[PDB]
Design an enzyme around this catalytic site. Structure first.
Site, PDB file in Angstrom:
ATOM      1  CG  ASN A   8      -1.875   1.260   1.186  1.00  0.00           C
ATOM      2  OD1 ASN A   8      -1.979   1.980   0.191  1.00  0.00           O
ATOM      3  ND2 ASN A   8      -2.520   1.514   2.319  1.00  0.00           N
ATOM      4  CE  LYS A  15      -0.180   2.606   6.575  1.00  0.00           C
ATOM      5  NZ  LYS A  15      -1.591   2.679   7.065  1.00  0.00           N
ATOM      6  N   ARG A  83      -2.031  -2.154  -3.818  1.00  0.00           N
ATOM      7  CA  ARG A  83      -3.291  -1.531  -3.453  1.00  0.00           C
ATOM      8  C   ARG A  83      -3.418  -0.218  -4.215  1.00  0.00           C
ATOM      9  CG  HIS A 172     -13.153   1.493   3.550  1.00  0.00           C
ATOM     10  ND1 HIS A 172     -13.871   2.583   3.991  1.00  0.00           N
ATOM     11  CD2 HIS A 172     -11.914   1.620   4.079  1.00  0.00           C
ATOM     12  CE1 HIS A 172     -13.101   3.336   4.754  1.00  0.00           C
ATOM     13  NE2 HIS A 172     -11.908   2.775   4.823  1.00  0.00           N
ATOM     14  CG  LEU A 201     -17.885   1.318  12.068  1.00  0.00           C
ATOM     15  CD1 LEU A 201     -18.603   1.266  13.410  1.00  0.00           C
ATOM     16  CD2 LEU A 201     -18.598   2.265  11.104  1.00  0.00           C
ATOM     17  CG  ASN A 203      -8.987   3.165   7.897  1.00  0.00           C
ATOM     18  OD1 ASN A 203      -9.818   2.377   8.370  1.00  0.00           O
ATOM     19  ND2 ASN A 203      -8.574   3.091   6.633  1.00  0.00           N
ATOM     20  N   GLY A 204     -10.798   5.527   7.993  1.00  0.00           N
ATOM     21  CA  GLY A 204     -11.992   6.141   7.452  1.00  0.00           C
ATOM     22  C   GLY A 204     -13.147   5.247   7.855  1.00  0.00           C
ATOM     23  NE  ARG A 233     -10.733  11.047   4.896  1.00  0.00           N
ATOM     24  CZ  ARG A 233     -10.243   9.905   4.425  1.00  0.00           C
ATOM     25  NH1 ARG A 233     -10.810   8.745   4.742  1.00  0.00           N
ATOM     26  NH2 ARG A 233      -9.176   9.924   3.638  1.00  0.00           N
ATOM     27  CG  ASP A 275      -7.142   6.775  19.472  1.00  0.00           C
ATOM     28  OD1 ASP A 275      -7.805   6.105  20.294  1.00  0.00           O
ATOM     29  OD2 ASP A 275      -6.236   6.280  18.769  1.00  0.00           O
ATOM     30  CD  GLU A 378      -8.280  -2.941   4.070  1.00  0.00           C
ATOM     31  OE1 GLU A 378      -8.143  -3.065   5.312  1.00  0.00           O
ATOM     32  OE2 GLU A 378      -8.371  -1.829   3.502  1.00  0.00           O
TER      33      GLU A 378
HETATM   34  N1  LIG Z   1      -8.901  -1.435  21.355  1.00  0.00           N
HETATM   35  C1  LIG Z   1      -9.135  -0.467  20.433  1.00  0.00           C
HETATM   36  C2  LIG Z   1      -8.318  -0.362  19.306  1.00  0.00           C
HETATM   37  C3  LIG Z   1      -8.567   0.633  18.362  1.00  0.00           C
HETATM   38  N2  LIG Z   1      -9.592   1.487  18.536  1.00  0.00           N
HETATM   39  C4  LIG Z   1      -9.852   2.544  17.546  1.00  0.00           C
HETATM   40  O1  LIG Z   1      -9.782   2.073  16.195  1.00  0.00           O
HETATM   41  C5  LIG Z   1      -9.244   3.096  15.341  1.00  0.00           C
HETATM   42  C6  LIG Z   1      -8.215   2.516  14.377  1.00  0.00           C
HETATM   43  O2  LIG Z   1      -8.867   2.086  13.183  1.00  0.00           O
HETATM   44  P1  LIG Z   1      -8.036   1.428  11.968  1.00  0.00           P
HETATM   45  O3  LIG Z   1      -6.989   0.505  12.545  1.00  0.00           O
HETATM   46  O4  LIG Z   1      -9.006   0.899  10.935  1.00  0.00           O
HETATM   47  O5  LIG Z   1      -7.276   2.705  11.347  1.00  0.00           O
HETATM   48  C7  LIG Z   1      -8.629   4.163  16.235  1.00  0.00           C
HETATM   49  O6  LIG Z   1      -9.323   5.399  16.041  1.00  0.00           O
HETATM   50  C8  LIG Z   1      -8.810   3.652  17.653  1.00  0.00           C
HETATM   51  O7  LIG Z   1      -9.255   4.680  18.542  1.00  0.00           O
HETATM   52  C9  LIG Z   1     -10.416   1.366  19.693  1.00  0.00           C
HETATM   53  O8  LIG Z   1     -11.380   2.142  19.894  1.00  0.00           O
HETATM   54  N3  LIG Z   1     -10.168   0.394  20.605  1.00  0.00           N
END
Ligand SMILES: Nc1ccn([C@@H]2O[C@H](COP(=O)(O)O)[C@@H](O)[C@H]2O)c(=O)n1
Ligand SMILES: Nc1ccn([C@@H]2O[C@H](COP(=O)(O)O)[C@@H](O)[C@H]2O)c(=O)n1
Lengths: 394, 394
Positions: A8, A15, A83, A172, A201, A203-204, A233, A275, A378
């Site tokens: 990717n 990556k 990708r 996605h 649900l 990253n995006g 976003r 986050d 993926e």
């Molecule tokens: N134990 C976890 C691990 C990740 N997450 C959330 O999942 C998201 C990461 O998504 P991706 O890996 O798809 O990018 C982060 O925003 C993080 O806050 C969570 O809420 N609890």
């Protein structure tokens, strides 16, 4: 024991994963982050970020390639998977990369200027460093190409669609394709006679309505910006409200595009973090704006899950997937409680279980719709496409 | 035998109705169209457009007022009702117009610059020409004020909401309020324990989720632009796609706002008409782009009806209303067939019936959700508010 190299090659970083063909499991994974900036580095397995500074895409991949030979893994690379962000209308399935394919990717590249040109850089590199290795292009839009025009047309003048290419593409795709495939087995359904909603649900964030194995409606639009509110976003936003803002504060369209991509979403409402783990803790400690951001987040997902259900003759499954989807016990439940209207009853004992439990049902028996968690892969889907295309003779 | 004078003093014209208090039926209705332009005219009942040229809002209403006295109806005007486009957050119900109210309307007026200032012009006129007559302000947003923050927040930086007022307001409030009230009686439901979806399809198009008598979610946003695709309005559009267009063709935000309001929607996809009757005929005669426009139109309605259902604990009724909603046998059916997922079965004998049949059920018995047509009456709702406020002592 042959391996598939997955790439990717994003705008900011590169990556990669090295999957074994026999098991489809990751032997090695890394990242070349902070690309082109004075100090570029390579972090393989997260043991030592080797500062391959002063370098571009061609040499960063040549740094990864040398490390493959350091582990006597170079000679074993049978396939390379790339990708691609945007396939346009030209790509409906994954393809073996030829000159024709490179051209067609370059043709639709105006639609994703940041991502696509970065993807092509990585294709050239892998082509240079591995010329006698079959290479596959996997596109992030191609699954959503089964959408009917009423699903992908915007209410704009027809000319914007026919000459310029302005329509809904969705993203996605690979994740939505993978997860949907896995759902048929997990839920013991007939692909040819099924309706699923998949909530990716993380990253995006995006929703996809999968009817009889085909993507019939999806949350994201021409850009990954439309649909659900996300980490940074904004999601669905009134254009009139945007035009109003541009007048009231005197900001350029360029300003707002940056505001909506980087300053918006969960980060924007909370003013704290993009986050989830931080915002979940923040609410648990009496922070109203973090609570509001999550409540809004959950609401818009609930809106789009129910919305996309319309494109189904029948609703068999809602499937949660992606970082937030697989791990957030809270969000999953708030979303499902919001959809009591669809006749969902949630087994909270099953919803408690952490991600280590993998593919799991999370709705109780009286439920009229099966809820489930399916971890997205993926990398595995890219490999499977490549292995399949590996048996072909071009 | 007292009467209520209803005024929708829009930007381009001044519509009015004279309802009898005893019956709530229209005795007289007119329009002062092409306002301020060289030739302005007054058309009462559609018998003779008297060219009251070279005139503004103050004298156009003075032309209507003279014609009320021509029919010995002036002395009988007990109440005047003003339709207001945007109430902002300040107005949650209809009010008796005082100086304070005029100020508060003037405060939120930046949110609807075209409409609100035109409404205020009409308020001053009616105040001047009828000073000893109680006047009521009815707002087109106030019904939707019961929305929770997760329903009305955009995923933008919080500052845009707190200081500037950027949020979801929603429109067709009076229509949505009226129709919902009528549905409780028609469907024999308990207001305090009910969930309805109301599809106001016509001029503009909007959806409202009415839970236990309260608006909990609505299709339109800050401007009447968000939501469903409409006659000349685009509806939901990807901001990234808009920003892309602004780059690719080099158009200002001002250009696009005009494109999305006037050149878009049904008119845009078909390239033929913004009128349904024309497009329905056009499709019936092998026109693909008119068929596509309708198919898209129906799809987006189906998307938002199902979407808004999420904000309900239970779905009892879908209600069609407005020009297109009350009259289009086709659109109603295509929408309902699209929502088979919600368990809708449609009685096509009942769906056949023209608008003269008024408030009617259109779904068969096996249906899990009651569909109905309810003719909207904004004039009657404005009168009822005024009659109610008439008994009050300020
Ligand atoms: N134990 C976890 C691990 C990740 N997450 C959330 O999942 C998201 C990461 O998504 P991706 O890996 O798809 O990018 C982060 O925003 C993080 O806050 C969570 O809420 N609890
Ligand atoms: N018999 C009718 C009457 C009106 N209509 C449609 O209803 C719309 C008018 O809506 P309003 O009166 O709410 O503005 C028009 O676009 C017209 O095409 C229809 O499709 N069939």
């Amino acid at each position: 024991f042959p391996v598939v190299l997955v790439i990717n090659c994003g705008s900011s970083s590169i990556k990669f994963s090295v999957l074994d063909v026999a098991t489809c499991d990751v032997l090695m994974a890394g990242i070349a982050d902070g690309m082109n900036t004075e100090n570029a580095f390579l972090s393989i397995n997260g043991d030592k970020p080797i500062n391959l500074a002063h370098s571009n895409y061609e040499d960063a991949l040549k740094a990864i390639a040398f490390e493959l030979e350091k582990r006597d893994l170079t000679d074993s690379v049978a396939l390379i998977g790339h990708r691609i962000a945007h396939g346009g209308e030209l790509f409906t399935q994954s393809v073996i990369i030829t000159d024709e394919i490179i051209d067609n990717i370059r043709r639709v590249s105006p639609l994703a200027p940041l991502h696509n040109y970065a993807n092509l850089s990585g294709i050239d590199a892998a082509r240079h460093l591995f010329p006698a290795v079959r290479q596959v292009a996997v596109f992030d839009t191609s699954f959503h190409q089964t959408l009917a025009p009423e699903a992908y047309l915007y209410g704009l003048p027809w000319e914007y669609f026919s000459s310029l290419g302005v329509r809904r593409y969705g993203f996605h795709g690979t994740s939505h394709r993978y997860v949907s495939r896995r759902a048929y087995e997990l839920l013991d359904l007939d692909e040819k006679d099924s309706g699923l909603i998949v909530a990716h649900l993380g990253n995006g964030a995006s929703i996809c309505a999968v009817r009889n194995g085909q993507s019939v409606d999806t949350s994201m639009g021409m850009t990954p910006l439309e649909g659900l509110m996300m980490g940074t976003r904004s999601g669905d936003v009134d254009f009139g409200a945007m035009a109003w803002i541009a007048k009231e504060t005197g900001q350029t369209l360029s300003d707002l595009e940056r505001v909506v991509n980087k300053e918006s979403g969960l980060l924007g409402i909370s003013g704290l973090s993009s986050d989830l783990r931080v915002l979940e803790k923040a609410w648990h400690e009496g922070h109203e704006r973090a609570r509001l951001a999550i409540k809004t987040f959950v609401h818009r997902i609930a809106r789009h899950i129910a919305g996309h259900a319309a494109s189904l003759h029948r609703l068999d499954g809602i499937i949660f997937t992606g970082g937030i989807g697989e791990n957030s016990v809270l969000i999953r439940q708030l979303v499902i409680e919001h959809l009591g209207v669809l006749g969902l009853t949630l087994d909270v004992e099953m919803n408690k279980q952490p991600n280590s439990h993998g593919e799991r049902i999370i709705s109780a028996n009286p439920s009229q719709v099966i809820c489930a968690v399916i971890p997205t892969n993926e990398e595995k889907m890219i490999a499977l496409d490549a292995i399949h295309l590996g048996n072909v003779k071009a």
